[PDB]
């Protein structure tokens, strides 16, 4: 939701930097001389940065040795033809993937780097055993968080950079926040007011603060492990967590979004389902054996996945996640009832609890002070007749001096 | 536009539930024993849910029977090598697609499920004949709406769930609503005000209500058939359609969006093109044989595709769709002319017609109360200085009590 609050970064900037270093003279020969003996080595470039180096395919030692002497010529066996095809197919597929993705591909395909080669690279990376273990057990995630930048093809050697991820934060507690509109449940149309928490997404403890990811679609989840990317994050204070237990806390101004659009929807959570059933919409929660087990009343309610298989809102049928865990229902008055609908700002996106309360303080000023000037319309007096003698104010008119 | 009004759902939740059922002990043996005779069968799991089961590739009865006895060892036929390669290539490509997409792929590829096997599953699915017909003629769309979750590879068998779509609503009338900014056409720069309908997207009749899809890019079209997904939809009453014929109807409060950004644009519709030409922008409509046939005046206008091939707005060139059909132009006064620019709220997202009327009634309240009260009031009467003497009003002045 709050994805616009994020910064803008260059993903392949590091790999491209190493790429521009590889264009320099002699830089490629250092690698070719380092891998002249073994297939894997560690090489320090001109600028001192040390990078891993790997030789995955040697068509030179195949075409120049096993294929060249035959090339008047004649082929004697057919097995060498299929052997050459098997050797060349990898280069062909890599060429295809690059020629489509303009030289930068992501995720890293198996043609670009097989599982054996990827696990070898992880084994020799200058990181901890915990990091090697994490990257080795989740190679599918490492492939999805890596790039493949094609660099140069000089001096009978081909070169491309594999930009691998570094997991500097591991095993700290995380939690995912789900939100849904909280509207009133009046009968008249458009008379309802709505309010929605906007701080939804992933939160993880990191360096005495919290890393917030507003677009949870970009965070990949495997088992109870959450692989997020700090590039799509916000560094918030720890007090953000207070918004869950006390949205009216003074130490942090919780972000909301106000409107008048009372439409029904549902948000499938990790262990259940939130259902916002407004209007004449019919919302139910059902089990695969007996059927409907709850018909939601108008409002925002919750249903755990313990014994529930589907949740239907209107014409939409959601399957809830059947993950094992304990769901706790915390009672509470819906805060939308604490508000007066006559001074409720209905056009608020990038809002907060205090920002809306201050916009209410102004409207209370505008109506209780300035509009009540209507009371001073009939409450004041007109000019008495500009006649001979004097007039006194009796009843609602100027009635002279007979009374004298 | 209104995509934020949608809920959040889990797509593979059903397939993942069935997958977690397959992790249980003995379930794999039930599946392995059911397919011992035929290649496809129907199996009811422990929880009673009945699912179709398919064995698409049998490498067991090839490696152990046709390949094992040859492995002193020596291969006699060379054709058997290529035969094994043709049999194994499918497993290799399935492995690639899974290892890249982290175990969940969409659309379902031909390696994952060939056309014959997919039509077999559709033919043996327990649904109506009309659903079989629909899914059989549009396998490309069914693939685009299906998932492939890799489950387990236990006890000499490979298993993955293919999550296929069920089209429970077929052949009901649908319609696509296109919108474009409707601004004034003043000559001054910042004096213009703009208004745009947000109800753009797909609408379909369903169960006495309307399924609304705000992100029409996700709905796929083949011929006059529209394959949408209820997951990203909204259940609206039928009265929403009134917004097309009567934007000021009382039974539904139509959603709009106000601004002051009068920029020129064009919206290519199904049978024509809407052109909003504001400012000094030059917008034309041209035919490939004759050339320019219309120079748009400042405002929002329409052009049918009957005889028109391209429409240019500024430096942007649009090709109109050449589908056969009748386009009808309904004249009418642009509603933006019904508004006063001095009381027109310009900062408005997620608004409605009555929501604009409420702020306009409020602004007129402060104006009709301020200028009509201050002027009628302005000519009141001051008081005589408080000097312990009572004054009476004569000749527009305060004279002290002069009686004896």
């Amino acid at each position, epitope marked *: 939701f709050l994805g616009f609050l994020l910064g803008v970064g260059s993903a392949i900037a590091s790999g491209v930097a190493v790429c521009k270093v590889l264009h320099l003279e002699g830089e490629v020969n250092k690698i070719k001389s380092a891998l002249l003996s073994t297939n894997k080595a560690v090489v320090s470039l001109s600028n001192g940065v040390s990078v891993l180096t790997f030789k995955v395919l040697d068509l030179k030692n195949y075409i120049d040795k096993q294929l060249l002497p035959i090339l008047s010529c004649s082929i004697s066996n057919i097995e060498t033809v299929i052997e050459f095809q098997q050797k060349n197919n990898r280069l062909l597929e890599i060429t295809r993937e690059f020629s489509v993705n303009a030289g930068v591909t992501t995720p890293v395909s198996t043609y670009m780097l097989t599982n054996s080669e990827l696990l070898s690279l992880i084994n020799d990376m200058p990181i901890t055993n915990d990091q090697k273990k994490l990257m080795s057990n989740n190679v599918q995630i490492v492939r999805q968080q890596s790039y493949s930048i094609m660099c140069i093809i000089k001096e009978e050697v081909l070169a491309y950079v594999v930009q691998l991820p570094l997991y500097g934060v591991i095993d700290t507690p995380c939690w995912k926040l789900h939100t849904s509109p909280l509207c009133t449940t009046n009968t008249k149309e458009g008379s309802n007011i709505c309010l929605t928490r906007t701080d939804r997404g992933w939160y993880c403890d990191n360096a005495g603060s919290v890393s917030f990811f507003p677009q949870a679609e970009t965070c990949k989840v495997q088992s109870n492990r959450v692989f997020c990317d700090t590039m799509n994050s916000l560094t918030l204070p720890s007090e953000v967590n207070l918004c869950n237990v006390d949205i009216f806390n003074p130490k942090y101004d919780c972000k909301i979004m106000t409107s008048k659009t009372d439409v029904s929807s549902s948000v499938i959570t990790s262990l259940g389902a939130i259902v916002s059933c407004y209007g004449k919409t019919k919302c139910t929660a059902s089990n695969k*054996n*007996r059927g409907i*087990i709850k018909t939601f009343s108008n409002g925002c309610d919750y249903v755990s996945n313990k014994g529930v298989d589907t949740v239907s809102v209107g014409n939409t049928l959601y399957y809830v996640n059947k993950q094992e865990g304990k769901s706790l229902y915390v*009672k509470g008055e819906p805060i939308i009832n604490f508000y007066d609908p006559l001074v409720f700002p209905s056009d608020e996106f990038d809002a907060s609890i205090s920002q809306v309360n201050e916009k209410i303080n102004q409207s209370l000023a505008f109506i209780r002070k300035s509009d009540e000037l209507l009371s001073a319309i009939g409450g004041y007096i007109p000019e008495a007749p500009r006649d001979g003698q004097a007039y006194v104010r009796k009843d609602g008119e100027w009635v002279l001096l007979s009374t004298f | 536009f209104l995509g934020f009004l949608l809920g959040v759902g889990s797509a593979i939740a059903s397939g993942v539930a069935v997958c977690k059922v397959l992790h249980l002990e003995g379930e794999v043996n039930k599946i392995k024993s059911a397919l011992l005779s035929t290649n496809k069968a129907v199996v009811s799991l422990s929880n*009673g849910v009945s699912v179709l089961t398919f064995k698409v590739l049998d490498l067991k009865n090839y490696i152990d029977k046709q390949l094992l006895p040859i492995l002193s060892c020596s291969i006699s036929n060379i054709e058997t090598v290529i035969e094994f390669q043709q049999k194994n290539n499918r497993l290799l490509e399935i492995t690639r697609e899974f290892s890249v997409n982290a175990g969940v792929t969409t659309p379902v590829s031909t390696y994952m499920l060939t056309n014959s096997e997919l039509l077999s599953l559709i033919n043996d699915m327990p649904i109506t004949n009309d659903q079989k017909k629909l899914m059989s003629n549009n396998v490309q769309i069914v693939r685009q709406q299906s998932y492939s979750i890799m489950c387990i590879i236990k006890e000499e068998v490979l298993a993955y769930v293919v999550q296929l779509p069920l089209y429970g609503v077929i052949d009901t009338p649908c319609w696509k609503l296109h919108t474009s900014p409707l601004c004034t056409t003043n000559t001054k720069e910042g004096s213009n005000i703009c208004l745009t309908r947000t109800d753009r997207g797909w609408y379909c009749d369903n169960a006495g209500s309307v399924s609304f899809f705000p992100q029409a890019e996700t709905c796929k079209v083949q011929s006059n058939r529209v394959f949408c997904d209820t997951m990203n939809s909204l259940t609206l009453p039928s009265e929403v359609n009134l917004c097309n014929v009567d934007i000021f109807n009382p039974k539904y409060d139509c959603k709009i969006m106000t601004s002051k950004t009068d920029v020129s644009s064009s919206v290519i519709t199904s049978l024509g093109a809407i052109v909003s030409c504001y400012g000094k922008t030059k917008c034309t409509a041209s035919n490939k044989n004759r050339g320019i046939i219309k120079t748009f005046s400042n405002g929002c206008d329409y052009v049918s595709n009957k005889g028109v091939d391209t429409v240019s707005v500024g430096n942007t060139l649009y090709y109109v769709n050449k589908q056969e059909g009748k386009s009808l132009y309904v004249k009418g006064e642009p509603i933006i002319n019904f508004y006063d620019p001095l009381v027109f709220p310009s900062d408005e997202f997620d608004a409605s017609i009555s929501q604009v009327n409420e702020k306009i009634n409020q602004s007129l309240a402060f104006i009709r109360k301020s200028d009509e009260l201050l002027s009628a009031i302005g000519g009141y009467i001051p008081e005589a200085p408080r000097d312990g003497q009572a004054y009476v009003r004569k000749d527009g002045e305060w004279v002290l009590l002069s009686t004896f």
Partner: antibody
Amino acid sequence: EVQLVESGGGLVRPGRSLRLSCTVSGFSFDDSAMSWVRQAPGKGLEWISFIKSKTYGGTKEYAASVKGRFTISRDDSKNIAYLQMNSLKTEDTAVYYCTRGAPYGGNSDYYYGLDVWGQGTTVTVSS
Amino acid sequence: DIQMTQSPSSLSASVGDRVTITCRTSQDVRGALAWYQQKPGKAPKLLIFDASSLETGVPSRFSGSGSGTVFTLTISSLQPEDFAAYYCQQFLDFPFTFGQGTRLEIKR
């Protein structure tokens, strides 16, 4: 944290009355529904009574063996649930457990099992 | 009322064996069963709810299956802690009647 403690058991003459009381501590008592299940000495489990949440009408459902004789009630102000046993027979000598019925979701009038169980209190009905 | 029938009433088995208790109901309970484990003197413990759903904290050796009328509780690998009594309970409508129970003894 979650605890159910039943009290009020003991000796009682055949034909009189005795009130069992289950104290709940650890979760919201008003939102949940309570049940009474007894086990006779040497015999199996027998489901006795059930009272639904305040949200669902406070509906008391009894078993055929104790219908008209037993009466279930709840006092949500102090988180306690009573089982009034009137016109007691000698067969009512048993261990009485207090349980909490678990709704098919977080909150639903369809229940799938008995989540929490008290340790039970022994009631002996003999002259 | 709905009649419950647990079979068998006694089961003799050794440690590490695979055992299966059956619960027959009189009607189609629409998968509204429950399995409880009661050790002698102590309160029963809910193991499986709905038909096969496993309660939190229950080992993987406990399996629930069956549908409609016949339901089975299965212990894959028996452990010395699993020797107790087992009851099935219906949750379709009131009364939520219990089963007779199944006594589990050690084979000797």
